Amino acid sequence: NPFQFYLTRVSGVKPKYNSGALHIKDILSPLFGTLVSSAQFNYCFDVDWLVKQYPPEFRKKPILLVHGDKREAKAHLHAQAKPYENISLCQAKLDIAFGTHHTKMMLLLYEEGLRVVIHTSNLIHADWHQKTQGIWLSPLYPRIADGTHKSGESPTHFKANLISYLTAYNAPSLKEWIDVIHKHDLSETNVYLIGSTPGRFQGSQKDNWGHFRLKKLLKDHASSMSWPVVGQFSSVGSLGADESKWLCSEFKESMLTLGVPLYLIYPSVENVRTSLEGYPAGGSLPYSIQTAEKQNWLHSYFHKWSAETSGRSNAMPHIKTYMRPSPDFSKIAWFLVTSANLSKAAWGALEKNGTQLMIRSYELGVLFLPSALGLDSFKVKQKFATFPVPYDLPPELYGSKDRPWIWNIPYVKAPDTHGNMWVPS
Predict the structure, then answer these.
(1) Is 418 a catalytic site residue?
(2) Domain limits of the chain?
């Protein structure tokens, strides 16, 4: 299968809905290769839990946790890890305020080669239990033969792009991973890397990251042919007093690039209330009343979470996806799975009269382009050459009574799936 795009397993749905899905235990299985060492980039970690996901035989192999924790939270993470002698930590520098290290990626070095996994799940039990999450699995990259002269690069330039991404951390522990990557052949890679890294990027450096990086790839490797843009995420930042400030101006502009209706999918209160988790799903859908009340204009773009196609309408989304379907939603010009939610922090925001792109966070995704497969478009796989879109199309608009899930206000008029109310505080 050319895509290697997978959803995580969801407990409590019919087996047919998990047949082609993966659990972290599957990803780390001996069947995937003989593990020597690994790196786990993420945001939240439950170390005891993480360790048990590795098979017993591999549990003592070295593990690098790359995170953005600071101060006490950092101390706590070090405390979680102390008992496991084989675990080292790398604190990603977060020199711009309010940034987070949000990238979810696994680097898995085996006796037989190297695997890169870019996905959407935090390393905690609940993210892999009853949520809809996405996974892209690289091929097993072989090591470059000890006497050849090859770049090991793919036509999408994934190898150099991933190295640049690691290089931006400027961390000694990652230099070791960069060196490992240099040693392998990633030429079979058919996706484009889209990363965000904290900084202020000017000149041509603007095209390296965030939504400009996406813009640049859509201009170079896609071509033009009322194809809407679909954006689907689990968090929402403060986007401005009105939409011309960022959403429609730079964000949509980048997304509509090729060689226009914008539909945003974000769970309503009702979607969360009736989920497999009930209201506690809302603990992973941050959207503060503080921010929401300043931008009620945004909510007219919102569409309900519906995933009958993958049996996951009740499995709340923590996956994030962006794509460009045709007017009848039967095909798509491209598809992106990433850790980036709907925020300036994640995607970047122009500064100094559009000469400088400011990004606060680390984010990472893979872009699927028909040109990389020799195609002009992908047909949408109706029931999860055809791309497996994990939610239903066309997107369904919020009803008049719907509200976007807002996590720091109470919902006490209707009980959820487990008969509970939600009272933050």
Answers:
(1) no
(2) 1-190, 191-425
